[PDB]
Ligand binder design. Structure first.
Ligand code: NA
Length: 121
């Protein structure tokens, strides 16, 4: 149908907007601490601590498969990256501190993406 196509045109434009948002969030992590999944060979106990691992590359594969239906689902994954890190790592570590900085600097990008998604549908 012509309906399914226009919904596919919208999802595709949402995917284009989330791609740009994702590139902007990732620029706030120049150390690439959150780039890749936490290694299970190097942190074998990780899954005893953290039940839903997340990282930028895993968000990227979901993105290019048009796996995010809305901005909220995308925000949930970003929050997991941050919240996982702040639980596993203690306050006086480079990892925890990197999360806090990504959270505060990401807020601005997420604040405007919410207005743009509403605004253009
Ligand atoms: Na902790």
């Amino acid at each position: 149908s012509m309906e399914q196509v226009a919904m596919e045109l919208r999802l595709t434009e949402l995917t284009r907007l989330l791609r740009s948002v994702l590139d902007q969030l990732q620029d706030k992590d120049p150390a690439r601490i959150f780039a890749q999944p936490v290694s299970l060979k190097e942190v074998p106990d990780y899954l005893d601590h953290i039940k839903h691992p997340m990282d930028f590359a895993t968000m990227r594969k979901r993105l290019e498969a048009q796996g995010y239906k809305n901005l909220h689902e995308f925000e949930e994954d970003f929050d997991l990256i941050i919240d996982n890190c702040m639980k596993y790592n203690a306050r006086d570590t480079v990892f925890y501190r990197a999360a806090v900085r990504l959270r505060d600097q990401g807020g601005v990008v997420l604040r405007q993406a919410r207005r743009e998604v509403d605004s253009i549908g």
